[PDB]
Amino acid sequence: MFLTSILLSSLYLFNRILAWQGNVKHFYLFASNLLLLFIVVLYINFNTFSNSFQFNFELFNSLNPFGLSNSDISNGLLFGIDGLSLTFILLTVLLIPLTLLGNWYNINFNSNLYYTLVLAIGLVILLNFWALDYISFYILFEATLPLLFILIHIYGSSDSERASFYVLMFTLSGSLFMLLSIVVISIVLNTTNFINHNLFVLSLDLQTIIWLGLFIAIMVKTPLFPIHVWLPVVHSESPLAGSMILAGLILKLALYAILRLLLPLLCEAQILYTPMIYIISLLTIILTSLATLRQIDLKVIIAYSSISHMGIAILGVCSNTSLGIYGSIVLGVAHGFVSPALFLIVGGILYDRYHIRIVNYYKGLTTYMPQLATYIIILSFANIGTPLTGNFTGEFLSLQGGFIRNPIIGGISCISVLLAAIYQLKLTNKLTGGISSIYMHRTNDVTIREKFIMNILIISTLIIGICPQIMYNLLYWTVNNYIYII
Amino acid sequence: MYNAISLIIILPCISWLFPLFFGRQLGYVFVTRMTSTLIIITTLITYYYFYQLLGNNNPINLELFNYLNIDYLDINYNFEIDALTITMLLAITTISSMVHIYSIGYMETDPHQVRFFSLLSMFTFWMIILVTGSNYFVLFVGWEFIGVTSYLLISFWVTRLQAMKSALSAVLMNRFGDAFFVLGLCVIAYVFGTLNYSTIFATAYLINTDLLVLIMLALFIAAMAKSAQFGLHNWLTLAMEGPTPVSSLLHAATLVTAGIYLLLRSANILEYTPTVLFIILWIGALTTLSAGLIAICSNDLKRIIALSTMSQLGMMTIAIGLSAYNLALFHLLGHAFFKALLFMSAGSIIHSILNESQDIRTYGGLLSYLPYTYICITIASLSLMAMPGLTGYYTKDIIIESTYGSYSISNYVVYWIAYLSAVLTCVYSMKILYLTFYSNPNNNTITYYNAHESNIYITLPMFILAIFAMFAGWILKDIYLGVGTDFVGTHILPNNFSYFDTEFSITQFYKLLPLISAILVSILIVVLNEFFAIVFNLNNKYINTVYSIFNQKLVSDQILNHFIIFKGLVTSGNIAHHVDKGSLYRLGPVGINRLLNKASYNVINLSSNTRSSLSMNSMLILITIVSLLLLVLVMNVNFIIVIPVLISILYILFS
Amino acid sequence: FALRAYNEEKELALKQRLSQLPPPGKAFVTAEGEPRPAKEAELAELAEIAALYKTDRVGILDILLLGNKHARLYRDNTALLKDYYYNGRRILDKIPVKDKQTGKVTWEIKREGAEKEDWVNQMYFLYAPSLILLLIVMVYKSREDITFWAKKELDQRVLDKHPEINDAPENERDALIVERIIAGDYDKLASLQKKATP
Amino acid sequence: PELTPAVPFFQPYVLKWAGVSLGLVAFYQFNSSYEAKNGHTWVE
Amino acid sequence: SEHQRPELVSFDDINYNDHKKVREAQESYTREQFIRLEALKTVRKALEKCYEESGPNHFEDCKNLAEQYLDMLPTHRLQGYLGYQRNDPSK
Amino acid sequence: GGGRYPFPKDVISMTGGWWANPSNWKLNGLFATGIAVGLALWVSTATLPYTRRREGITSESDISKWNAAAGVWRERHGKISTGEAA
Amino acid sequence: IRASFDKAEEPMLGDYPDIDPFPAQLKNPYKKYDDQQDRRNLEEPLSVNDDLYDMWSPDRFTHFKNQDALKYFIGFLTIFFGASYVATYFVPEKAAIPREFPYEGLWKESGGTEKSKAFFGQRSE
Ligand SMILES: CCCCCCCCCCCCCCCCCC(=O)OC[C@H](COP(=O)(O)OCCN)OC(=O)CCCCCCCCCCCCCCCCC
Ligand SMILES: CCCCCCCCCCCCCCCCCC(=O)OC[C@H](COP(=O)(O)OCCN)OC(=O)CCCCCCCCCCCCCCCCC
Ligand SMILES: CCCCCCCCCCCC(=O)OC[C@H](COP(=O)(O)OCC[N+](C)(C)C)OC(=O)CCCCCCCCCCC
Known about the structure:
Strand content of chain A: under 5%
Oligomer: part of a larger assembly
Radius of gyration of chain F: 31 Å
Number of domains of chain F: 1
Order of helices and strands of chain F: HEH
Domain NADH:quinone oxidoreductase/Mrp antiporter transmembrane (chain A): 131-410
Strand content of chain F: under 5%
Transmembrane segments (chain A): 27-46, 77-101, 113-131, 137-155, 167-189, 209-233, 240-259, 271-293, 323-351, 372-392, 404-423, 452-472
GO molecular function, one term (chain A): ubiquinone binding
Largest interface: A-B, 53 and 52 residues
Helix content of chain A: 55-70%
Distance between the termini of chain A: 55 Å
Number of strands of chain A: 2
Number of helices of chain A: 22
Keywords (chain A): Electron transport, Membrane, Mitochondrion, NAD, Oxidoreductase, Respiratory chain, Transmembrane, Transmembrane helix, Transport, Ubiquinone
Number of domains of chain A: 1
Radius of gyration of chain A: 22 Å
Subcellular location (chain A): Membrane; Mitochondrion membrane
Structural class of chain A: mainly alpha
Shape of chain F: elongated
Number of strands of chain F: 1
Helix content of chain F: 40-55%
Bound molecules: 1,2-Distearoyl-sn-glycerophosphoethanolamine, diundecyl phosphatidyl choline
């Protein structure tokens, strides 16, 4: 057979479906469920007894550009997975169909452009985890900006324009200093690959410099104090898939970037500059939580919580301990289950019904919208880290390791257990509480589409909250590769 | 196909979950009976298990699947019913079964009965998970989820605004304690590498006292929150905004006692941390005094009784600081029996009256109208006043005695503080009894025409709990307060054992004055309220202000909001505006925008006149050539001088 | 569902047949917002075209093989049925149900079934089962964690150094292996640290 | 006490969730039996 | 079962350019660390047995087991290969 | 019943709603009691093997062996007990 | 009354009305408002810091002014703890010694090793 004939069959079927029924979302949903299954098959065929990278394929080689390279000289972009990358891959295929299905009926102008852009962002994120060299990572790290800008500017809310320039300029700023560090790596080592980059022991004085450019970027993407001011706006004015994709995956890229670029190399700079990281993560936690206590827009509040949980996860991964790695990862997974549910509730339910996000209108949903109340409270108690939910198991483990590295900072950061409860329950009480708002008339309870989504995002986090050990089969190497202890 | 422990753990889970899934299909009737009957079956399992353990005392375990085995950290979902666990289960299971039967007659006419009964069984199941779990982690699960369930129960009337705010206060004090609890879990696992009771208690006699001090201080701060000692008793009185049965089950007998259970289970560690024992004692004396003073001068009914609960909890913490664990354990068991009964009688009172008021000042003389409710409340008050033969005498006087019988010299003062707490106990009890039954009426007339004893569903639980508050003490003082009991084998440090000295050193004066005073002041304040009522009605402006202090909980409720919460919200808004939306937009979008607005408007307003573009660009050539010739001249001779020339040039070009 | 159920004449007549009607978002309101404002034969006319929406008018082998000018007719004249069906479903709060025998469909109240969404067949039968497969696979790959391998290798290194235990009874080797583990070291970490030794 | 309109017990959510939960349970038990009879599970 | 028993390599005997040997040594160092952890866990289990069976006597019968656990805990734990792969102690 | 007031009927909750008492509940109550009893039995029979008494499982001779080996490891590694360093 | 925080925001209001805040908890409950629960009429202007001055905000107390409240709280606490210290100088002596135990303070059964008796040895005998 011909590879070209199979994809020509697919493209032909896609053209006919586009021409008969003038819509794509059925084909994209099919492709999304197909990718999920194919990734599951890769997990079936993935050996957990090997720290090596599997399913390697190289692209854009000199000899066979539009195919795959079997050469003895590799000058192209590399790809392949370890168990770390497979974890977030499973998170991304799991979310993409839901990010399309959270917008199945509310997009009515230029719909096919929207579902194209969503799938392109989701596929680009997926391939970023397969990346095995600094340059392929970077060119798939920066490829979401044009699509996010376009998506937000067209299908956004009132203040879409300001949000779109913010997601672009901030992320581009941090990315460019990442490019400088990568370029210094590339003119020194003369090789960029995530296979043998830990062997090369650069001088300390140069690790102290490369680290600054990598960390400037990761401050801007994660985000972290004091570059935490783009996230609330970009979430507030984005379409629902933009918010779900962002909070679920793009903020997890910063964590994958640390583990894959910054720790196996630059070890000595990590163990020297870790206390400055603890300063920054701690300020991120408390100040963003307290800033959340006095906000008015619903979607902005969920956004601030995302900054806090990422800042806890940075305490753990940057702690030089196994439990820190396994917690910071599980935070990223459970966060990418919980936060999309909340952004769905506050961005594709309430905003669809009443077209406003101010808390002052909302009150007394429990009377006419009870099922929405039940989901709000469950997700609120999972967000804050009620046990038997991954957002606790990850909080606890990261605070174990943060306490080990610096006990004072790792214990003064335990107040996140409180402050998360404050800024989330002050809101949940308002929504589920009181007499029905006079400003709001009645509308339907949650429909089955949204109930499907929230029940998936809750079953997944309850599972990893009940038996987190399932994820260890992929990560038992990764908890020890990135530990610099003599 | 029998398992006491499996059935104890699954049946409540059935009764919590099945109604939530099947309530619209089953109706509030069958749900009330199914949850009642299943929680009845559970109570029988525990009483029979209690018998067997008295016969043998080899606890059963239940080792289930692994939650986390990563690296030097094995946490399984282990479960166990030991001696301390089976006592906490006796309180929980008995009180919850009574309440499930009492809340049928109390919650009729309420539309949302199903969710109410599901939550009661939810709390029961999660406390069962608390007392059972053979590791600190399984404890933390029950700790959090009972605070969650408390939020929902206190918020059971979702329209009532004040109920919601009290729910938020309760669950945020919960997390203010749970944060420190996680800090203790992180420290326990850094030190011992595990979280289970077996390893930690087999080793705690070898590890540095500073580490156990940090651990126990954090766990105690969590217990201070839940057990509602003086620093964090705010939530407790607010938690009465919910229905009465919730007050009977949670904030009377069970949820508050979770902190005492934590300390009793960690007693094997606490014996090597004298500092925390001393703090626990003195914080408890502060509680048991402030509560009584706040109770004698209150007019709400549920408030007084919940404050009585705060006092007995303070006295249990006193005993724990005197290193007599079995005594506080016994007072827990009694305190459940003679306090849930009070809250049930309070409900039958409140419903006999037409408007469901909670003010003794408008109750009067229901004695002839409500005799059965009266005999039950006075039983509990006497079991609270340590009348002879009742459980409270055994459970309470012995703690007042060990205060004198302790080897420490400075604990003598705590005897008097406990004794003042006692005479205050007889005060506020007899106050409720006079104001509610003996006094002249103070309502209208129709209230007395329609007062009526409540149905069978209300009485029978008060009957059984009355039997328990009459007989349980003499039936179980051979197990707990006995001489060499070995049932609750906590490894007491021999140096701290004083029960023999407690029972023998004590004289007549120090064995009679509590009992004498409990009778005498009780009868006295009755005589004053009935014959010389002016004494409580002087209308002096310096007495009435002190009444205003002891009302409003020693103004702490106003200290907390204004100085902590309000100065947290303002600081939070100071942050959100002045930083997140102030300087951090200035060092970013806003400031860079203004900076570029000017710099671009000064760059382009440089070739100023369009009148002749030629001479201007020509002069620009001459300036640039001259400037470069002179700049290179300066930077040949010295380069650290040309730099400011270039800063200023950039200013001239961009200002 | 069907294979070659397309028909040209029906669509080419249905085009002008729908064009003779007023626009969908104004048919059932009559520009005032009242369902009764429409006539009765008009109402049945609309309901009978709307029932046509959920009817098999094309098949797989017809979409793969026919040309653009016909598919375009299907597209632009099916969008109208979509709009009419759903505007009437919202406004009247009825659906059009042709009963078995009588060839006359009209709006009706029954909605307890017979209505499915276009996203169900994909998700409930391709996504969810794959998630369940993922759960099963994570569970049965957890058996390949290093903790069990390491326990098995420690027992074997002990039996190698100390073969004698094998002849002892079959429910005592566990405790004997425990004793021998607690005695000494069966790790070889200091054997990999060779230059560390001075 | 008053009555309300009749409601079926076996609503779809009960069927779905119960069948899936209990089906995964049945699979776990069957695979444990296969492991008892052989050296490996079926999914292995 | 087919219990694999791989080969033990060290960083001090390999050249860092032949990647297969480096991966072998990395996996070896990590596997031996996990084995040290399992030995610690078995000590913990025996300690809990000695406590649950003894009771008040644990102070004597479990003494050496408890000291052994508290001496092993700071050392028998994951500590990673990079700090030996990127540091020669002979200098 | 007593003390009632109107309520919307379309509002649907997994719980009752308002004064929920459908005219079939005897049958549904039978189904629920049957499932609950079967679940309780399945759980008890499943958890039986995973039970054990705290004691009686491990012989004291095994404990003495293990404590001996503990002393052996401690002296091979040349370690001293807590407090001796004084 | 305009508090500190609420008149430090004067330079920033621009065109917004500089309202004088009054918490709703003190507003007359017996008046008929549109939103009877929050005690707000429909087009009532809002202060910049209304999140502090609505009903969902923390409760105010109108009896004691907060400074006198702090005086009373701390004065009660200090009285209690100072009495509890002073009364340790007015304490009688114990009528009997602490118990003492046979085998050298039970150092063996407390986990001793003949050299750590200071750490583990209980009372002499
Ligand atoms: C200044 C920066 C602080 C940064 C670090 C964080 C410090 C702790 C957290 C304080 C920050 C401010 C919190 C503001 C949240 C307010 C949310 C809200 O609006 O709800 C109000 C609620 C009280 O509700 P309320 O109106 O009073 O209703 C009662 C009527 N039924 O409010 C509440 O219920 C209160 C919830 C917080 C409970 C905290 C209690 C602390 C008490 C400490 C006493 C000292 C104890 C000793 C501790 C030992 C430490 C070594
Ligand atoms: C060898 C040594 C050489 C090294 C370089 C040394 C740097 C010397 C820089 C001086 C050269 C002249 C450029 C000065 C900027 C020009 C405009 C200006 O004067 O700034 C004022 C501007 C005014 O703001 P405002 O008060 O609101 O408006 C009324 C002004 N009459 O201010 C503002 O808009 C508010 C400022 C807020 C702070 C923003 C901080 C942003 C920092 C990142 C800047 C990145 C962009 C750099 C632009 C380069 C332009 C030359
Ligand atoms: C541990 C994993 C999750 C366990 C499964 C829990 C979900 C089961 C479905 C509950 C449906 C329900 O409770 O109803 C939803 C209730 C309806 O109240 P109502 O009684 O029906 O009367 C109707 C009268 N209204 C209309 C006036 C209210 O909405 C609420 O008032 C908000 C309370 C939410 C209770 C949440 C249940 C406890 C779960 C908390 C665990 C984190």
